[PDB]
Amino acid sequence: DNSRYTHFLTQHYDAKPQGRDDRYCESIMRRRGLTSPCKDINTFIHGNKRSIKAICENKNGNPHRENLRISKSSFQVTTCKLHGGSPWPPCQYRATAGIRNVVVACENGLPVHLDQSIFRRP
């Protein structure tokens, strides 16, 4: 079904953010249900949803590493990194904005998984 794709959009897609700063992270992580308890790191992709889906096809993607796909285009992204040493709220975040290639895993031609590890640096 469409459920794993919808999960991916919920955790990793925000088309038109205002801010892209710490307060943006603190709010969107809460809106998307990632603060009970606090997720340690999470990246949102901005812009055109259909360009993200195209990573699963030759239009905007290539094979990457072990059965993943990397985008041909680059995307505006915001990575939210949890501050401090507790998994429990309050969930305070620091934002890192970037323009990056995105790595996904696809199922049935839809992105379902972000390779979140690549956004740990910088």
Residue numbers in the entry: 2 to 123
Publication passage describing the model:
Angiogenin (ANG), a 14-kDa basic protein is an angiogenic ribonuclease and member of the bovine pancreatic ribonuclease (RNase A) family (also known as RNase 5). Like RNase A, ANG cleaves preferentially on the 3′ side of pyrimidines and follows a transphosphorylation/hydrolysis mechanism. In addition, the crystal structure of human ANG has revealed that it has an RNase A fold and the catalytic triad (residues H13, K40 and H114) is conserved. The enzymatic activity of ANG is several orders of magnitude lower than that of RNase A towards conventional RNase substrates, but essential for its angiogenic effect.
